Amino acid sequence: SMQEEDTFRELRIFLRNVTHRLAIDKRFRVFTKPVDPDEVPDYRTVIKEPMDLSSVISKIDLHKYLTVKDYLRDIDLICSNALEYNPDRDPGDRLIRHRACALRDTAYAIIKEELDEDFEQLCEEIQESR
Numbered sequence: 001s002m003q004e005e006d007t008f009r010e011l012r013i014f015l016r017n018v019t020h021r022l023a024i025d026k027r028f029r030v031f032t033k034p035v036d037p038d039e040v041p042d043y044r045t046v047i048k049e050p051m052d053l054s055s056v057i058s059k060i061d062l063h064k065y066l067t068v069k070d071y072l073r074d075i076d077l078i079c080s081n082a083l084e085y086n087p088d089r090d091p092g093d094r095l096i097r098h099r100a101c102a103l104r105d106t107a108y109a110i111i112k113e114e115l116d117e118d119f120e121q122l123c124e125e126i127q128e129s130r
């Protein structure tokens, strides 16, 4: 229905706004573009599904997310990729792990405060009907 297409358009507006607020935070600059395969050629041998905030906006605009749950699976993949690629005790690995955990915690905190639980349930019920 037109009402259901209006529901998904409101979800995309919400997701673009959350993603922009994460992308302008200086702590999260390393997560804003894909890891350069020229400068880090081993990255795509270890990490089987790369993800970054520029790819997330492209996916919102391609209508890939029909729920906030499917958006949060990609925020979780950005964080888990950083923890698995950078697991060592040295300061550069510990700094990127702390920033990855902060990106995840910040996204979940904005959604807990600003997403109505009945708007998410409506998106889940339209998705399940398709």
Ligand SMILES: COC(=O)N1C[C@@H]2C[C@@H]3O[C@]2(Cc2nccnc23)C1
Binding pocket: 030, 031, 035, 039, 040, 081, 082, 085, 086, 096
């Ligand atoms: C989410 O970003 C990451 O997981 N990484 C790991 C890479 C390794 C290291 O820092 C990255 C980029 C880079 N470029 C040149 C030399 N070394 C590095 C960013």
